[PDB]
Amino acid sequence: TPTKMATLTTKQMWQTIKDYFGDGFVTGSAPISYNVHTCDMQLQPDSGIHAASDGIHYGVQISEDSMPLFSIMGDTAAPPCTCHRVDEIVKHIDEFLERAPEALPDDGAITSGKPCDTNPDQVSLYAMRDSLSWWVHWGGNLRPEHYWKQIYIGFAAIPDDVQISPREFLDGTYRYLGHTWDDCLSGLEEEGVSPDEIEFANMCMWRQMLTQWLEKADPELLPLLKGKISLMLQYRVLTANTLGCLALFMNATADPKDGPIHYADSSYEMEIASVAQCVTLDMAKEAMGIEVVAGDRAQRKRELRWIYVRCMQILESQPHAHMLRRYGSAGLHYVPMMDRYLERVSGHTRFPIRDGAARILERFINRAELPKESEDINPNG
Amino acid sequence: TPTKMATLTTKQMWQTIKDYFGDGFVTGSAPISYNVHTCDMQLQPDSGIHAASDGIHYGVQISEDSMPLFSIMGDTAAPPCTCHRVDEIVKHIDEFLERAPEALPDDGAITSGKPCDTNPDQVSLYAMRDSLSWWVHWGGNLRPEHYWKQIYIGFAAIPDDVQISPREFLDGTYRYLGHTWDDCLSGLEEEGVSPDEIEFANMCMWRQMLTQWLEKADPELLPLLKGKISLMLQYRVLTANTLGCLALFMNATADPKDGPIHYADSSYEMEIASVAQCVTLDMAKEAMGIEVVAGDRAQRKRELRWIYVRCMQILESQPHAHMLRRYGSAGLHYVPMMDRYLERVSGHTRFPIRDGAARILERFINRAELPKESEDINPNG
Ligand SMILES: [Zn+2]
Ligand SMILES: [Zn+2]
């Protein structure tokens, strides 16, 4: 077989994830392909009678009717549905990709929103601090056999704080703390993640990189989504890649006796949990007081709480409630505790990485592949 | 049987809870009678292999070794043990009670620490807001069949914000939102709580009222406890009455098929969970930045985290992990969300009770038994 090495174009990448994910519940939605329709979720009254094994005992349980007790919360409202317009968004993106540039002017710029940041590897180190912090609040440990799943979280987090081109992400030009993306894929193989699970997580990452890049490369896209609230939420969940991170978290945390994690068999519960965590994050950040948001911000908040309570209740009865309830609601404890968000409250500064944290993070840095400008990161590690 | 109506003296109350609780793990400790020795707890390494039914999946899971990732957390340190001095504390209290006054000068004064508070029934209303807020974050609902268990939480919370004499608490002179203590006991009977469970919760409340009153009535007591850290913690857990509140929460939340909640059969897990919640509260309040604390506050914090992680790990394997893990760690999400603590951050003000919260709280007020000065509380309810 002749050795071909051409990096796919963004158009070909888009086509590839279209073919892999297929359509969601709307025809022509690929690759925006969720099967759960958030707008149709129903909330059932709680009878108060629960078995010890009931899923309500996992995660954080805050009933809808109790939310008025908390001033930072309140009442809920069903969101308007524009989800059936998804085919129009995909058609628009197909057209844009016929003449899209492979590079943007600000590629490589820091976008963390914290003026202290001047080195992109230092930003990656902070993102790695955050990635282990999320992993822990989801229920995970720091054992060495999950090293590369944690690196995956880092790759999922850094595109928000550093502008990365999908091409450079794919072809090894971009490195996260010295790691190429292929290093993560190869590492997941060394850890024993099945090839099918790796490729699902891989395609989710492709989709994240593409959708986040389109938001910056195509000036028509965000205006097109901003006015379609329910659709913007679908899109934001893809740019957050909570689904890909969840798949690998489940692989690390699931009962060994249980079979491998297949999205084909568990898409419903995984999608519900991925949406719940995104909504919880936005809930918690707003409540604490730290543009994609459109229209009346007060109404958008009532919609998030509507979605949150229904996502969480549905997760009560799902086969993996024992992981997905906590994944869905973890923002309620990780946002108040994590430096990432406390730094923003404190005038968007940077907390020092003390020696204990630095020693934890040291092994995640491939110092041999860093640029000379970054050889001195994590010095106390 | 001749009708006798004399209110017990504080000495007789003390004797009664001594006879009821008996000794803890130290001889002569009654009624400071915990059987678990916090100082002896051991932390086991996590193998990372867990069944779906493992208790680690309940509550919030933050491993000890991950805590350095969070600037507001850090490392841990084992506390020094003075628990075997408990007999000296009880002996001292026995002597003080031989000539103790039945009334203190500031009895009836507001002690909430929020200058806005001028009416003790309004303070009780705010405490009721908080009581339902704690109940919800523990996992409970607002269903009417748990009304009087929630009133119990209110009685457990108000002694911190209003100075109450044990005599007036007992004999019906003190009313919480128009409810006497006997009204709560009778209400718990109407709700179907077994007599033995009610009397356990009752004795826990007696013990809370006595121990909190002794701290103010006996100027020698706090100096005696302050220097015995591990003992002060035992005492503070009794003044918080997390054990009594837990017993009734479990009654409301437990599997119906399971038997009644008997402290005689479940004291170990209940004590561990009661300690964990108190330690979590203090952890979370300090981390957020809101005197019993003695010596080097930095060291005391390392001790709290030591106790927290060991309490939580032990709860993984207990029969009621499916309730007690969340009870133990709930402070990690209820402290950031509850008005009680947000008010203190905001210059110890009072957030308005909006119409939604007021409508929730209305049924907990017995307006027929309020003093005329308080007839206008919760007007929007
Ligand atoms: Zn919709
Ligand atoms: Zn001890």
Only one residue has tokens 């860093």, namely: A370
Minimum distance, in Å, between the CA of residue A73 and any CA atom of chain B: 8
Q: In angstroms, rounded to a whole number, what is the distance separating the alpha carbons of residues B268 and B314?
A: 10
**What ligand has the least distance to the C-alpha of A26?**
1
Query: What is the distance between the alpha carbons of residues A36 and A267, in angstroms, rounded to a whole number?
Result: 8
Residue B206 φ/ψ, nearest 5 degrees: -50, -50
Q: How far is CA A245 from CA A153, A154, A252, B193, B267, in A?
A: 6, 10, 11, 45, 40
Contacts of A131 (CB under 8 A, 6+ apart): A150, A153, A154, A156, A157
Taking CB atoms and an 8 Å cutoff, what residues of chain A touch B53? 53, 322
With the C-alpha atoms ordered B334, B337, B340, B341, is the resulting torsion angle positive or negative? positive
Residue B133 and residue A326: Cβ atoms within 8 Å?
no
Chain A residues touching B65 at Cβ < 8 A:
142, 360
Nearest to B68 among A143, A320, A360 (CB): A360
Closest-CA residue of chain B to A138: B61
The residues near B100 (Cβ < 8 Å, ≥ 6 apart) are B10, B11, B217, B218
A217, A198, A271, A188: which is closest to A20 by C-alpha? Answer: A198
Structural contact between residues A381 and A352, judged by C-beta atoms closer than 8 angstroms: no
Tokens of B371: 């003093």
- Spatial CB neighbours of B11, under 8 Å, sequence gap ≥ 6: B97, B98, B100
CA A11 to chain centre: 23
Question: End-to-end alpha-carbon separation of chain A, Å?
Answer: 45
Q: Are B150 and B130 in contact (CB under 8 A)?
A: no
Extract the tokens encoding A267: 């898409």
Does the distance separating the beta carbons of B141 and A63 come in below 8 Å? yes
Please give the Cα distance from A122 to A339 (Å, whole number).
15
CB contact under 8 A, A336 and B332: yes
CA B321 to chain A, closest CA, distance in angstroms equals 9
Q: Judge: B337–A287 Cβ closer than 8 Å, yes or no.
A: yes
- Calpha distance A43→A52 (Å, rounded): 22
B257 min Cα distance to partner chain A (Å): 8
State the distance from the centre of ligand 1 to the C-alpha of A278, rounded, in angstroms: 17
A52, A68, A323: residue with CB nearest B255: A52
The C-alpha atoms of residue A208 and residue A242 are separated, in whole angstroms, by 10
Beta bridge partners of A110: A162
CA distance B324 to B317: 11
Q: Amino acid identity, residue B302?
A: R
Beta-carbon separation of B52 and A322 below 8 A: yes
- Closest in A56, A142, A258 to B52, CB measured: A258
Is residue B216 within 8 Å of B163, Cβ to Cβ?
yes
Rounded Cα–Cα distance for residues A291 and A278 (Å): 16
Q: How many CB atoms lie within 10 A of CB A359?
A: 14
Residue A89 domain flag:
yes
Give the Å distance between the CA of A207 and the centre of ligand 1.
21
Q: Which two tokens stand for residue B151?
A: 């009133």
Of A69, A338, A339, the CB nearest to B129: A69
| Distance, CA of A381 to chain centre | 28
| Cα-to-centroid distance, B29 and ligand 2 (Å) | 13
Ligand 1 centroid–CA A80 distance in Å is 7
Q: How far apart are CA B72 and CA B309, in angstroms?
A: 15
Q: CB of B121 within 8 A of CB of B177?
A: yes
* B307 CA from centroid of ligand 1 (Å): 47
Residue B328 domain-assigned (yes or no): yes
In B, which residues are within 8 Å of A141 by CB distance?
46, 48, 63, 66
Distance CA B328, CA B139 (A): 11
Nearest-by-CA chain B residue for A250: B52
Query: Distance, in angstroms, between B277 CA and closest chain A CA?
Result: 15
Chain A residue closest to B254 (CA)?
A52
Question: Quick one: which of A265, A143, A148, A271 has its CA closest to B50?
Answer: A143
Report yes or no: B348 and B120 within 8 Å, Cβ to Cβ.
no
Residue to substitute from B71, B145, B349, interface A, most A β-carbons within 10 A: B71
On chain A, the residues whose CB falls within 8 A of the CB of B323 are 57
Residues A139 and A323: their CA atoms lie apart, in Å, by 8
Is the Cβ–Cβ distance between A356 and B68 less than 8 Å?
yes
Cα–ligand 1 centroid distance for A286 (angstroms): 23
From the list B63, B72, B360, which residue is nearest A142 (CB)? B63
CA distances from A24 to A86, A232, A337, B52 (A): 10, 15, 36, 29
Q: Yes or no: say if B35 and B271 are a contact pair by the CB < 8 Å rule.
A: yes
Of the candidates B70, B145, B359, the beta carbon closest to that of A133 is on: B70
Give the rounded distance of the alpha carbon of B95 from its chain centre. Answer: 26
**Phi (first) and psi of residue B162, to 5 degrees:** -145, 130
Distance from the Cα of B208 to chain A's closest Cα (Å) equals 26
The greatest distance separating any two alpha carbons of chain B, rounded to the nearest whole angstrom, comes to: 67
Nearest Cα neighbor of B164 from B156, B155, B174, B151 is B174
Structure tokens at A230: 């329910």
CB atoms within 10 A of CB A93: 21
Chain B residue with Cα closest to A53: B322
| Distances, alpha carbon B357 to alpha carbons A15, A122, A301, in Å | 51, 45, 18
* Closest residue in B to A255 (Cα–Cα): B51
For residue B261 the two structure tokens come to 């909640």
- Secondary structure of chain A in HEC code, one letter for each residue: CCCCCCCCCHHHHHHHHHHHHCCCCCCCCCCCCCCCCHHHCCCCCCCCCCCCCCHHHECCCCCHHHHHHCCCCCCCCCCCCCHHHHHHHHHHHHHHCCCCCCCCCCCCCECCCCCCCCCHHHHHHHHHHHHHHHHHHHCCCCCHHHHHHHHHHHHHHHHHCECCCHHHHHHCCCCECCECHHHHHHHHHHCCCCHHHHHHHHHHHHHHHHHHHHHHHCCCHHHHHHCCHHHHHHHHHHHHCHHHHHHHHHHHHCCCCCCCCCHHHHHHHHHHHHHHHHHHHHHHHHHHCCCCCCCCHHHHHHHHHHHHHHHHHHHCCCCCHHHHHHHHHCHHHHHHHCHHHHHHHCCCCCCCCCHHHHHHHHHHCCHHHCCHHHCCCCCCC
What distance in angstroms lies between residue B327's CA and the mean position of ligand 2's atoms? Answer: 23
| Domain assignment present for A346 | yes
Q: Report helix angle A229-240 to A263-288, nearest 10.
A: 100
- Judging contacts by C-beta atoms under 8 Å, the chain B residues touching residue A137 are 60, 62
Q: Calculate the CA dihedral of residues B92, B97, B99, B104 and round it to 10 degrees.
A: 110
Report the 10 Å Cβ neighbour count for A103. 10
Residue of A367, A380, A93, A134 whose CA lies nearest to A246: A134
Cβ B301 vs Cβ B255: under 8 Å: no
List CB contacts (< 8 A) between B352 and chain A.
Answer: 71
As a three-state string, the secondary structure of chain B is CCCCCCCCCHHHHHHHHHHHHCCCCCCCCCCCCCCCCHHHCCCCCCCCCCCCCCHHHECCCCCHHHHHHCCCCCCCCCCCCCHHHHHHHHHHHHHHCCCCCCCCCCCCCECCCCCCCCCHHHHHHHHHHHHHHHHHHHCCCCCHHHHHHHHHHHHHHHHHCECCCHHHHHHCCCCECCECHHHHHHHHHHCCCCHHHHHHHHHHHHHHHHHHHHHHHCCCHHHHHHCCHHHHHHHHHHHHCHHHHHHHHHHHHCCCCCCCCCHHHHHHHHHHHHHHHHHHHHHHHHHHCCCCCCCCHHHHHHHHHHHHHHHHHHHCCCCCHHHHHHHHHCHHHHHHHCHHHHHHHCCCCCCCCCHHHHHHHHHHCCHHHCCHHHCCCCCCC
Burial class of A377 by CB neighbour count within 10 A (0 to 12, 13 to 18, 19+): buried
Phi, psi of A176 (to 5 degrees): -100, 110
Return the residue of A nearest to B74 by Cα.
Answer: A356
Q: Residue B379: CB partners within 8 Å, gap ≥ 6?
A: B358
Tell me, rounded to whole angstroms, the distance of Cα A249 from its chain centroid.
12
Task: Find, among B361, B284, B271, the residue nearest to B330 by Cα.
Answer: B284
Reference B309, options B284, B327, B328; nearest CA is B328
Query: Best interface-test mutation with A: which of B50, B313, B333 has the largest number of A CBs within 10 A?
Result: B333
* Annotated resolution, angstroms: 2.0
Is the residue at A124 inside a domain? Answer: yes
How was this model experimentally determined?
X-ray
Say which residues have a Cβ less than 8 Å from residue A24's Cβ, sequence separation at least 6: A30, A32, A33, A34, A35, A86
Question: How far, in Å, is the centroid of ligand 1 from the Cα of A208?
Answer: 21
Q: How far is the alpha carbon of B336 from chain A, nearest alpha carbon, in Å?
A: 6
CA A338 – CA A346 distance, rounded (Å): 13
Cβ contact B198:B247 at 8 Å: no
Contact B336 A332 (CB under 8 A): yes
* CA distances in angstroms from A215 to A31, A96, A127, A226, A239, listed in the order given: 15, 12, 21, 11, 9
Region for residue A108 given its phi and psi (left: phi exceeds 0; alpha: psi -120 to 50; beta: otherwise)? left
Which of A43, A46, A54, A57 to mutate to probe the B interface, most B CBs <10 Å?
Answer: A57
Nearest CA to B245 out of B182, B328, B164 is that of: B328
Question: Would residue A52 count as lying in a domain?
Answer: no
Ligand 2 centroid to Cα of residue A143, in Å, is: 32
Domain that holds residue A213: 10-33+59-374
Selection from A374, A364, A366 nearest residue A148 by Cα: A364
Gaps after residue numbers in chain B (C–N over 2.5 angstroms): 290
Q: How far apart are CA A328 and CA A240, in angstroms?
A: 14
Q: Is A118 left (phi over 0), alpha (psi -120 to 50) or beta?
A: alpha
CATH of the domain at A256: 1.10.600
The owner of tokens 């071909």 is A4
Do A380 and A356 meet the contact criterion of CB atoms below 8 Å apart? no
Compute the distance between CA of residue A132 and CA of residue A152 in angstroms, rounded to an integer: 11
- Residue at token pair 């450079």: A168
Q: How many domains does one find in chain B?
A: 1
Mutate to test the interface with B, among A143, A333, A344 (most CBs of B within 10 A): A333
B186-193 long-range contacts, Cβ below 8 Å, gap at least 24? B187/B147, B187/B148, B187/B151, B188/B148, B188/B149, B188/B152, B188/B248, B190/B148, B191/B145, B191/B146, B191/B147, B191/B148, B191/B149, B193/B149, B193/B248, B193/B251
Main-chain dihedrals φ then ψ at residue B343, nearest 5 degrees: -60, -35
What's the gap in Å between A82 CA and the centre of ligand 2?
61
Contact yes or no for B241/B293 (Cβ under 8 A): no
Residues of B whose CB is below 8 A from A129: 69
Q: Which residues of A touch B50 (CB under 8 A)?
A: 253, 255
Q: Which residue of B has its CA nearest to A358?
A: B69
Q: What gap in Å lies between CA B143 and CA B154, rounded to an integer? A: 16
Residue B38, domain member (yes or no): no
B69 with A322: Cβ contact below 8 A: no
Residue A267 lies in a domain: yes
Q: How far apart are CA A291 and CA A61, in angstroms?
A: 30
Using CA coordinates, name the residue in chain B closest to A284: B337
* Cα-Cα-Cα-Cα dihedral sign, residues B369, B374, B376, B377: negative
Residue A26 domain-assigned (yes or no): yes
Report helix angle A10-21 to A195-217, nearest 10: 130
The span from the CA of B279 to the CA of B38, in Å, is 11
Backbone angles phi, psi at B378, to 5 degrees: 45, 55
